[PDB]
């Protein structure tokens, strides 16, 4: 879950998004559209081996 | 058909564009039209057929 | 459902005068302040189309009004172009406000044509196949507009064409026109110079092909 | 059905800013110019209440508008009070026009508290249990408000509470809030700074007790 030191079992590469082609700008419409991203655990997501929390958030 | 080296690979894109104001130039513009993906390594001859489209029964 | 505004009726309008809305061509210029917004652009990214139409008209007169208007669907017309061979401009529309009868239109005389050039003698043009017969307009699907009972317009023309389908940017086989049967008259005080509004609906379309947005030649 | 007016969206509004309507408490002050007229007074002559709620929102953008708004039902909130422990005034509402994010709210730092007095040393306040997590607001029942498709708001929260019923003048377990996801932007000419309107409906209420009109302590 946490990576004290980079390791094979810890990191799993990266994910990226690429603009495939130039988008269309119609007459008199505003510019700079907005995109949002959301994350959620998969149906098979599972944790293990509980631990004690870091109390840093109090500060 | 391809004829080249041994340990080389690549990708190719095939497309068709009906008539319009002028022939498309950019791969971006072409991508909107009908197209297909031909991999270099999967096979060596990715056959292609242009569909018959016309506002009549025949053509000149 | 696309809606558009035409010019307003005035008593100054003569008889047999007219104006027309060539569908779907008028969309390109957004004729009468009309913007379909979806079909208009969808046509650009395609080339071949095949769809019907469904129109409507409205004009509110009042108890002390009188007049007669003729509305009909005339196919294969070519009256939406200037004699040279260029479509009219918005300024020209605002200027004319109406299409007045002329011997040229009666005879199909001044419809667009190609100049012969320097090799030939200048021929005397006399007649053409796209003449306009003012009286026999009633033959085609039509309705009347009487100030005492003029409610609205309704029509539904099936598809037509030399071929099952045609190119969008060029095809023109259906057109809507309005004619002033009886000059408008009324007593002052009620609604003066009522406006004319039009609606258009295609039916069972089938867009064909795919390509980037059409580019001017 | 009670209806009320909130402040109008402006592009000057930052992101994560918000405003809330704590039901049924807002009725006492007729928040947003709202007067139920029947329930508002009926609560006064009773003491214990148990009812649900049903809300709605509206905001009309136009073709050339863009933005994102977040609306959700967050229970057990206590953001409708000033840090001292007093609810804001109508002048304060008209001044602020919006609730801007602050580390205090992020940490629950400045929520109302009792002063210790002269016997104790002054403690350094650091944190509280009523913090606000801006990102995770989506967990509770919520919806988005995008200028391209924002139609209206709809929600129906069942009753909740530490006990089956509570006192009307004090109970607060449900609250409506709106958040500005994307700052508003648009081309000039269309609707500018659209207004925001809210509606509220209780469901299956059960008023309890009987006494004269409640008197201020």
Swiss-Prot record, chain A:
Protein location: Virion; Host cytoplasm
Bilayer-crossing regions: none
Functional summary from the UniProt entry: Forms an icosahedral capsid of pseudo T=3 symmetry with capsid proteins VP2 and VP3. Together they form an icosahedral capsid composed of 60 copies of each VP1, VP2, and VP3, with a diameter of approximately 270 Angstroms. VP4 lies on the inner surface of the protein shell formed by VP1, VP2 and VP3. All the three latter proteins contain a beta-sheet structure called beta-barrel jelly roll. VP1 is situated at the 12 fivefold axes, whereas VP2 and VP3 are located at the quasi-sixfold axes. Vp3 also seems to be involved in the binding to host receptor ANTXR1 for attachment and uncoating (entry).
Subunit record text: Interacts with host entry receptor ANTRX1.
Protein known as: Capsid protein VP3
Shown part of the complete sequence: 614 to 672 of 2181
From Swiss-Prot, chain B:
Transmembrane residue ranges: none
Subcellular location as annotated: Virion; Host cytoplasm
Entry function: Forms an icosahedral capsid of pseudo T=3 symmetry with capsid proteins VP2 and VP3. Together they form an icosahedral capsid composed of 60 copies of each VP1, VP2, and VP3, with a diameter of approximately 270 Angstroms. VP4 lies on the inner surface of the protein shell formed by VP1, VP2 and VP3. All the three latter proteins contain a beta-sheet structure called beta-barrel jelly roll. VP1 is situated at the 12 fivefold axes, whereas VP2 and VP3 are located at the quasi-sixfold axes. Vp3 also seems to be involved in the binding to host receptor ANTXR1 for attachment and uncoating (entry).
Subunit field text: Interacts with host entry receptor ANTRX1.
Protein name per its UniProtKB record: Capsid protein VP3
Covered residues, full protein: 554 to 613 of 2181
């Amino acid at each position: 879950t946490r990576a004290i030191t980079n390791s094979v079992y810890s990191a799993d590469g990266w994910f990226s998004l690429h603009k495939l082609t130039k988008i269309t700008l119609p007459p008199d419409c505003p510019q700079s559209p907005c995109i949002l991203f959301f994350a959620s655990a998969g149906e098979d997501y599972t944790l293990r081996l509980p631990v004690d929390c870091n109390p840093s958030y109090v500060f | 058909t391809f004829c080249g080296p041994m340990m080389a690979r690549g990708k190719f894109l095939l497309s068709y564009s009906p008539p319009n104001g002028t022939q498309p130039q950019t791969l971006s513009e072409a991508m909107q039209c009908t197209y297909s993906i031909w991999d270099i390594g999967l096979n060596s001859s990715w056959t292609f057929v242009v569909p018959y489209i016309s506002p009549s029964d025949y053509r000149e | 459902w696309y809606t558009g505004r035409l010019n307003s009726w005035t008593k100054a309008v003569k008889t047999f005068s007219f104006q027309a809305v060539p569908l779907p061509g008028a969309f390109l210029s957004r004729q009468g302040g009309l913007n379909g917004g979806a079909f208009t652009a969808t046509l650009h990214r395609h080339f071949l189309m095949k769809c019907g139409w469904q129109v409507q008209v409205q004009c509110n007169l009042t108890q002390f009004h009188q007049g007669a208007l003729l509305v009909a669907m005339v196919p294969e017309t070519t009256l939406d172009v200037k004699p040279d061979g260029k479509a009219k401009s918005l300024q020209e529309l605002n200027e004319e406000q109406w299409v007045e009868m002329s011997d040229d239109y009666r005879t199909g005389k001044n419809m667009p044509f190609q100049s012969l050039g320097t090799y030939y003698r200048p021929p005397n043009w006399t007649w053409g196949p796209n003449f306009i017969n003012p009286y026999q307009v009633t033959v085609f699907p039509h309705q009347i507009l009487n100030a005492r009972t003029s409610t609205s317009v309704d029509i539904n023309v099936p598809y037509i064409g030399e071929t099952p389908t045609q190119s969008s940017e060029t095809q023109n086989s259906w057109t809507l026109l309005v004619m002033v049967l009886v000059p408008l008259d009324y007593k002052e005080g009620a609604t003066t110079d009522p406006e004319i509004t039009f609606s258009v609906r295609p039916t069972s379309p089938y867009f064909n092909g795919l390509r980037n947005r059409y580019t001017a030649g």
